[PDB]
Write a protein that binds this DNA or RNA. Structure first.
Ligand SMILES: Nc1nc2c(ncn2[C@H]2C[C@H](O)[C@@H](COP(=O)(O)OP(=O)(O)OP(=O)(O)O)O2)c(=O)[nH]1
Ligand SMILES: [Ca+2]
Ligand SMILES: [Ca+2]
Ligand SMILES: [Ca+2]
Ligand SMILES: [Ca+2]
Ligand SMILES: [Ca+2]
Length: 902
DNA sequence: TCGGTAAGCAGTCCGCG
DNA sequence: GCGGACTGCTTAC
């Protein structure tokens, strides 16, 4: 097989590399890598190395990496560009793996671990590590085993061994319900003392050294706690055995508010699953507890135990260990679904970077572009310092707040990357500038043609047309990968809808789910067999289809994120290829493109309708337009349609056969106008929205920019079994809105769009009457909590104190003295409730850690003093009043001549 | 939050005769 | 009471 790296490090003048050799074995080597860097040289000197602008360079070979680094410094001292890859491990990887890397994941040791630490005096701080580590569960991907290290004797109590028999049993048998599929994979090791446990853990680690190290909050808790505890008991050298090269750094993580400390383990790639989840999931969650996220992702119940976690080991050690094991497994289950580790490996090996660098799109793209240029013997420029400067972004149309009955939306495929490719925007393709007219003049095609030679953006920039820039070349490659995975995602989605349809008529039989590839549209043969399947098999197929859709979503959305990040990186001062001329060339072209096509679509539809100056495009944001289709429907007449699906078909056909050709024509003209390299503005129909045929549903409404709701029957060619609400920006979509309120507001919107005003009034009346019964957590607001200390003046709110911070301060005063009280962690999320006047907390609100029940000693008082009226008006009524006034509807029945008469 | 801009709403402070 | 000048937070792209 072809070799591939696992990890790479620079330690002084040595590269330390762990890799898989040509026989599939894991090896480690120390390499005295001699780096090269570059200086400009005279043209009269013969060379094969050129910078990106075509200027000749001489290669400088250094005796070692420190010499190379010193040379960079002296070149700065002289005032001359020091060209080349200054991150020497990236150059090493480029030299050592000069081909597209094919990796074998089965050879990569992925370790998932979690530790437990009993602490009677609050949160066990990783920097202090003053409490014994009393449990470690460490799952190894190569052995496919859970290695359980269990401390039986502690200063906080001596316990009996954990029982695998009880662990397996149902919670109704007094057991812990450790999943049957992992029971046989547990290797249980009890220890009579902590020193023995840790020494054995280190010997184990030495034997089975993680390449990828993950788990939940491992980077901020488990890793620094283990490191520091071993350091405290044994000394630093023993703690450094967590690094295969025995090198670590206590590294400070800084942002804006403060700083925290993590431990860098050289020769390990830490991908904390919480960080993977935050980067790759495209969710914003009210809580990031593993319980909370496992419930969201897997629909598994919260791990139930009695009393505080600080007493769980002594009171129920059996459950303590079982929950430690289950916790490790939950992360594995989340990964089986989301496939973020797979994603990270894919992107890391593609870029030829340390796997953990996938968190940095700037590092990722720097390596991609470097490797690409190096193939042509081209030489990358030195990174430079730039002051942070603001620059313009997208255009967003101001909508008229209103109901909108029939709506067809259209959206440009991968806009910013497509602009880059179309215009040929790259550091080395800049050809010059032209004299800019107001943007409006380009939109309306009255400005002079920018260039007859170069490819242009309406920000004034011109680009070469003779050859693709490196940025267009490399962005195209990832765009193509993205396109493939999106295809699989959409097929799985369409396939899921077939199954949902079939589930209306389940067959009464015992059978099996079909063995199919959900990434490809079901054949007629499959469709016929599905129509004969039982509900049990159908539901299993649906679950599998949706799992396939999730896998495709992960693969596509994050490749989209990477390519959009390249467009964004051009406007980040830390990017080697930072250039506001290029960043703005992209955003300004986008502004023109949207407004250009708004004009074209309005012109086309006014033509087919035989009107003048009518506004068909009601809205647009960045790269999308929303077209009113009322007149199109009305041209055939509602009564002519058999059912909802009939007008949906008609609009779909109209969009594809009439509107899309007109859209393409408009964009080809714009391409010629800007003299672009290649027409890539592809705007396809996205949504077809409207009320159910013959109903009083309003179909949709806008309240303002980035705030709307649509009843969608077809999205990107997925025809839904049941209509789906597309809601953007409204409170139902915000993590800050209480859970039960999101749900209620969603149902109000559903009723408005599908059923009408009367249905809405019926539901409002009911919610208003019953809501005080809702669980306090479900009606709590949520907020991130930054700068708590900043607004704290002797335990009370300082000037300008935010509402949620006030709640935290109220909480802090209420828990002064309570030993079992959780602390609010700076920068994390909190639940927030309003409090009625004259409450014993002495303020108008209280806040506590999100994803948790409020501590028992104040819970009863909070419940008693919760201000339901304020809660209702602020989270439910105010937003609903916003929705209904926009839609010209009333959520309460107004008086009529029938009232109180006949 | 260690890792692009536009723009919405909550809330504080305080004017607005 | 609402709206502007702010801070804070969160979402649409
Ligand atoms: N830097 C950055 N830009 C974004 C992000 N989301 C959207 N944009 C910008 C770049 C996109 O091309 C443009 C339009 O956003 P869309 O959500 O429609 O995505 P896009 O057109 O790229 O892909 P698509 O084919 O429609 O799924 O807005 C983002 O998360 N980060
Ligand atoms: Ca735990
Ligand atoms: Ca788009
Ligand atoms: Ca059937
Ligand atoms: Ca869009
Ligand atoms: Ca098309």
């Amino acid at each position: 097989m072809k070799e591939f790296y696992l990890t790479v490090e620079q330690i002084g003048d040595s590269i330390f590399e762990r890799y898989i050799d040509s026989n599939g074995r894991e090896r480690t080597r120390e390499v005295e890598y001699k780096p090269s860097l570059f200086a400009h040289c005279p043209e009269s000197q013969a060379t094969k190395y050129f910078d990106i602008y075509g200027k000749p360079c001489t290669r400088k070979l250094f005796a070692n990496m420190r010499d190379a680094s010193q040379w960079i410094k002296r070149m700065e001292d002289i005032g001359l560009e020091a060209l080349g890859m200054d991150d020497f491990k990236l150059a090493y990887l480029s030299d050592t793996y000069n081909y597209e890397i094919k990796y074998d994941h089965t050879k990569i040791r992925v370790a998932n671990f979690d530790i437990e630490v009993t602490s009677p005096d609050g949160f066990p701080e990783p920097s202090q590590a003053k409490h014994p580590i009393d449990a470690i569960t460490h799952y190894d991907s190569i052995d496919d085993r859970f290695y359980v290290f269990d401390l039986l004797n502690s200063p906080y109590g001596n316990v009996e061994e954990w029982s695998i028999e009880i662990a397996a049993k149902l919670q109704e048998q007094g057991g812990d319900e450790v999943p049957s599929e992992i029971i046989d994979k547990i290797i249980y090791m009890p220890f009579d003392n902590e020193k023995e446990l840790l020494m054995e853990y280190l010997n184990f680690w030495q034997q089975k050294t993680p390449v990828i190290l993950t788990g939940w909050n491992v980077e901020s808790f488990a890793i620094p706690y283990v490191y520091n505890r071993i350091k405290n008991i044994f000394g630093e050298s023993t703690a450094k055995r967590l690094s295969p090269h025995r090198k670590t750094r206590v590294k400070v993580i800084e942002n804006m508010y403060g700083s925290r400390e993590i431990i860098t383990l050289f020769g390990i790639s830490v991908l904390d699953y919480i960080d993977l989840y935050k980067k790759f999931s495209f969710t914003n969650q009210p809580s990031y507890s593993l319980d909370y996220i496992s419930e969201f992702e897997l629909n598994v119940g919260k791990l139930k135990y009695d009393g505080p976690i600080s007493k769980l080991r002594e009171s129920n050690h059996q459950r303590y260990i079982s929950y430690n094991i289950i916790a490790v497994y939950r992360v594995l289950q989340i990964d089986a679904k989301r496939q973020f580790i797979n994603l990270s490996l894919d992107m890391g090996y593609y870029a030829k970077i340390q796997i953990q660098s996938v968190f940095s799109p700037i590092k990722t793209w720097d390596a991609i572009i470097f490797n690409s240029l190096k193939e042509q013997n081209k030489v990358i420029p030195q990174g430079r310092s730039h002051p942070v400067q603001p620059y313009p972004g997208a255009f967003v149309k101001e909508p008229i707040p209103n109901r909108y009955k029939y709506v067809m939306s259209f959206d440009l495929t991968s806009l910013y990357p497509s602009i880059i490719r179309q215009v040929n925007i790259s550091p080395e393709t800049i050809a010059g500038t032209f004299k800019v007219a107001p943007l409006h003049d380009y939109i309306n095609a009255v400005a002079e043609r920018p260039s007859d030679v170069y490819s242009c953006s309406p920000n004034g920039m011109m680009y070469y047309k003779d050859r693709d820039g490196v940025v267009p070349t490399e962005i195209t490659k990832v765009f193509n990968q993205r396109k493939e995975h999106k295809g699989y995602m959409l097929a799985a989605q369409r396939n899921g809808e077939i199954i949902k349809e079939a589930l209306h008529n389940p067959n009464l039989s015992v059978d099996e789910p079909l063995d199919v590839d959900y990434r490809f549209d079901f054949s007629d043969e499959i469709k016929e067999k599905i129509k004969k399947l039982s509900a049990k098999s159908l539901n299993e197929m649906l679950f599998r289809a949706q799992r396939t859709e999730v896998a495709g979503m992960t693969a596509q959305i994050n490749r989209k994120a990477l390519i959009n990040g390249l467009a964004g990186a051009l406007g980040n001062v830390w990017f080697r290829y930072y250039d506001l001329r290029n960043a703005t060339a992209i955003t300004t072209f986008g502004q023109m493109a949207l407004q250009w096509i708004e004009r074209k679509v309005n012109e086309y539809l006014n033509e087919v309708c035989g009107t003048e100056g009518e506004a068909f495009v009601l809205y647009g944001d960045t790269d999308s337009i929303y077209v009113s289709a009322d007149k199109i429907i009305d041209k055939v007449g509602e009564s002519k349609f058999r059912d909802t699906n009939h007008w949906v078909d008609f609009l779909d056909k109209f969009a594809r056969e009439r509107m899309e050709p007109a859209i393409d024509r408009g964009f080809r003209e714009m391409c010629e106008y800007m003299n672009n390299k290649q027409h890539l503005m592809f705007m396809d129909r996205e949504a077809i929205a409207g009320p159910p045929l013959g109903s009083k549903g309003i179909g949709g409404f806008w309240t303002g920019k980035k705030r709307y709701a649509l009843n969608v029957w077809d999205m990107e060619g997925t025809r839904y079994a049941e209509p789906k609400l597309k809601i953007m920006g409204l409170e139902t979509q915000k993590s800050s809105t209480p859970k039960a309120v999101q749900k209620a507001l969603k149902e109000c919107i559903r009723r408005m769009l599908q059923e009408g005003e009367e249905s809405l009034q019926e539901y409002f009346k009911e919610f208003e009457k019953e809501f005080r019964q809702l669980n306090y957590i479900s009606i709590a607001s949520v907020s991130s909590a930054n700068n708590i200390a900043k607004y704290d003046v002797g335990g009370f709110p300082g000037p300008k104190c935010p509402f949620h911070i006030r709640g935290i301060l109220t909480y802090n005063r209420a828990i002064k003295g309570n030993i079992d009280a959780p602390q609010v962690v700076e920068g994390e999320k909190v639940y927030v409730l309003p409090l009625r006047e004259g409450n014993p907390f002495g303020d108008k609100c209280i806040a506590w850690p999100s994803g948790t029940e409020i501590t028992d000693l104040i819970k009863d008082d909070v419940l008693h003093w919760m201000d339901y009226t304020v809660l209702l008006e602020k989270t439910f009524i105010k937003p609903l009043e916003g929705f209904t006034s926009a839609a010209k509807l009333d959520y309460e029945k107004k008086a009529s001549l029938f009232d109180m008469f006949d």
